Each structure stands twice: as structure tokens, then as C-alpha cells.
Design a protein around this ligand. Structure first.
Ligand SMILES: COc1ccc(-c2nc3cc(F)c(F)cc3n2[C@H](C(=O)N[C@H]2CC[C@H](O)CC2)C2CCCCC2)c(OC)n1
Lengths: 11, 229
């Protein structure tokens, strides 16, 4: 789930 | 009556919830003209990709969410995404439209491409939501409650999620006593609706694969959230 991880960790 | 902190929480949840695509934007497209199952599948995947993106931003603004374990954060999103999509669809469906419009919208959805097997329970759930006569705040709080469900699979710290869900449940309960004082069963009815939401999540992949199309193309983001491709 690297896209979801990206969307959660982005400012 | 709501406290100053609860009133603050409610407006903050409302503003974040209002960042979604307008119901009218969605219903205008469906009502305007009839589309083939191929065009409707494409409309659905794009609508669902937008929904997931907007849901992640809504979820991030939920009080205490950013303090949770990162793996639990993902389990919560993966666990609620489909339920939140169907709850949003139920809201848009029960929004008042001119005479005959909601009859055409229902007929257009019935012939979208989805197999008849899933049509009846989907419209049953939609019509049950409509009977509740829910306000915009009730839909917003219920969506927040759906996302912050501690009884979600793979959750490591259930108590951490519980602490976040409880103040939202309290606000909803106060609004249910204010909005419908003649119906003291209203809060219980909304909580009951969440069990029906979970059934759609179990049959989500089949609903999509049984669509009347030759190829079922999904976006990389939808492949992560849905159990497809
Ligand atoms: C997976 O099976 C299915 C089968 C029907 C739907 C479904 N129910 C709807 C009820 C409405 F009242 C409505 F307006 C649209 C609705 N759709 C589609 C859609 O576009 N849903 C998005 C979801 C995310 C939001 O942000 C916006 C709406 C569907 C309607 C028919 C043409 C194609 C698109 C679905 O949505 C949950 N899932």
C-alpha cells in the first residue's frame, strides 16, 4: 500500500 | 445540549466533509444522458479514485488520527474506504431533486452495468438511509465514526482508536436527541445502519468484476484500496 502510505505521510 | 468544545468539533468536521464533490455534480452527469456499461464503469472508477483521495485528506484532519500508529492508520483507511463510498452514494441518492428526477436516477443506476444480484440490496440500503431523514452533520459524523472503527481487522491498539471514536459518538447522540426528539430510537437506528454498510464491503470485488464490461481496468490507487487486479 505505497500510494496510501504516500498520501498519509505527505504534508 | 452540545458543549463549546463539541460545537467546535462539529463545525471543524463539517468544513472538512464539505471539501468533497457536490452531489449535484454527480447527479447532473448521470441524469443528463444515458451511457453504456463501458462508459459507466469508467465514470465509477474515476468517481471512486476521487473519493479515496478526498477521504484520505478528510481522515488526516480527524482529531488524534496523526498521533496513531502508521500501520493502524492504513488498516483504518483500507477498512473503511468502501463503506464510506457507499454511505456517500446513499447521501447523494436521498438528496431532494425535481419531480421524476430521483426515479430516472434510480433507473439509470439500475441499468449502469452492475448485475441485478447487487442492485436490490444496494437500493434497500439507500432507501433505509432516506427513511432516517439525516442532516448533513449526521452524515459527516457517521462517516468519521465509520473511519474510526476500532473493531477493524489488523488494528494493533484498539483503545487508541476507541478514545478517538467516543467523542464523535457523543456528539452524534446529542444531535439525534436535538434533531429528532419524537424518535428516541434515531441514534440506535444510525448505528444499526453501519452493520448493513459492512455487507457491501464483503461483496465489493464481486460487484466490480460482475460489471457488464469486457475489461475491468482499475487505477493503481483503487488496486490498493479494493481487492482487485
Ligand atoms: C461498485 O458498485 C457500485 C454501483 C453503484 C454505485 C453508485 N451508487 C450511486 C448512488 C448515487 F446517488 C449516485 F449519484 C451515484 C452512485 N453510484 C456510482 C458513483 O458514481 N458513485 C460515487 C461514489 C463516490 C462519491 O464521491 C460520488 C458517487 C455509479 C452510478 C451509476 C453510473 C456509474 C457510477 C456505487 O457507488 C458506491 N458502486
Amino acid at each position: 500500500h505505497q500510494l496510501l502510505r504516500y498520501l498519509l505521510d505527505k504534508d | 445540549e452540545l458543549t463549546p468544545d463539541q460545537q467546535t468539533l462539529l463545525h471543524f468536521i463539517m468544513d472538512s466533509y464539505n471539501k468533497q464533490r457536490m452531489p449535484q455534480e454527480i447527479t447532473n452527469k448521470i441524469l443528463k444522458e444515458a451511457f453504456s456499461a463501458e462508459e459507466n464503469f469508467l465514470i465509477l472508477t474515476e468517481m471512486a479514485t476521487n473519493h479515496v483521495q478526498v477521504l484520505v485528506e478528510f481522515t488526516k484532519k480527524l482529531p488524534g488520527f496523526q498521533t496513531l500508529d502508521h500501520e493502524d492508520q492504513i488498516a483504518l483507511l483500507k477498512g473503511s474506504a468502501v463503506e464510506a463510498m457507499f454511505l456517500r452514494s446513499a447521501e447523494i441518492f436521498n438528496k431532494k431533486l425535481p419531480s421524476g428526477h430521483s426515479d430516472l436516477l434510480e433507473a439509470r443506476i439500475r441499468n449502469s452495468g452492475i448485475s441485478d444480484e447487487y442492485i436490490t440490496p444496494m437500493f434497500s440500503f439507500y432507501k433505509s438511509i432516506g427513511e432516517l431523514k439525516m442532516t448533513q452533520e449526521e452524515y459527516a459524523l457517521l462517516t468519521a465514526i465509520v473511519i474510526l472503527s476500532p473493531d477493524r481487522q489488523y488494528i494493533k491498539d484498539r483503545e487508541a482508536v476507541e478514545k478517538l471514536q467516543e467523542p464523535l459518538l457523543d456528539v452524534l447522540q446529542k444531535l439525534c436527541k436535538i434533531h429528532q426528539p419524537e424518535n428516541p430510537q434515531h441514534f440506535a437506528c444510525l448505528l444499526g445502519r453501519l452493520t448493513e454498510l459492512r455487507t457491501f464491503n464483503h461483496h465489493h470485488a464481486e460487484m466490480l468484476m460482475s460489471w457488464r464490461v469486457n475489461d475491468h481496468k482499475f487505477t493503481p490507487l483503487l488496486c490498493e484500496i479494493w481487492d482487485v487486479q
